[PDB]
């Protein structure tokens, strides 16, 4: 039944969010990208891959932080914006951690899709396999920034 399956699916995902378990992945160096994350096991279409884990903040704090980050070229670009219940939030993963979602590179034709996953009105950004993923693949998803200012500075956004 759609009901029992929706329940089972929620329990798998929530279990994984909470454990912060990030099995099946490793960091590699990728020519022209810096670090990236390689799958070490197969993932099936629809599987939880990893959370995009960082600091969950609202719009005012996000703006404050960007202004600060821009004053430093070495910072890098780890803020992930979304809409939730008519408000803008951001998962800011700028701080170096051992979490892997923040190291995944961009492709418009990647193998992960980001989903908003509500746990009791607290939003989480999760990456789900958009297709079966072979061990050895680079994990990739669409960063989603299509703006002229960004694609000019960072031309790999076009691909």
């Amino acid at each position: 039944s759609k009901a029992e399956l929706q329940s089972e699916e929620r329990k798998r995902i929530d279990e994984l969010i909470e454990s912060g378990k990030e099995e099946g992945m490793k960091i590699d160096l990728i020519d022209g990208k810096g670090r990236g994350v390689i799958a070490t096991k197969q993932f099936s279409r629809g599987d939880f891959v990893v959370e995009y884990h960082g600091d969950l903040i609202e719009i005012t704090d996000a703006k404050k932080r960007e202004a600060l980050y821009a004053q430093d070229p070495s910072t890098g670009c780890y803020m992930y914006y979304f809409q939730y219940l008519s408000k803008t939030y951001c998962v800011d993963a700028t701080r170096e951690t051992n979490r892997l979602g923040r190291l995944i590179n961009h492709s418009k034709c990647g193998n992960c899709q980001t989903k908003l996953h509500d746990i009791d009105g607290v939003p989480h950004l999760i990456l789900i396999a958009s297709r079966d993923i072979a061990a050895g693949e680079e994990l990739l998803f669409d960063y989603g920034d299509r703006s002229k200012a960004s694609i000019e500075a960072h031309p790999w956004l076009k691909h």
């Binding site: 960007e66 980050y69 821009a70 910072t75 670009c77 780890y78 803020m79 992930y80 914006y81 979304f82 809409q83 980001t114 908003l116 950004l125 960063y143 989603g144 920034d145 703006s147 200012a149 960004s150 000019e152 500075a153 960072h154 956004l157």
Partner: peptide, 7 residues
């Protein structure tokens, strides 16, 4: 010049 990520 920075880029972002957007859902």
């Amino acid at each position: 010049k920075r880029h972002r990520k957007v859902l």
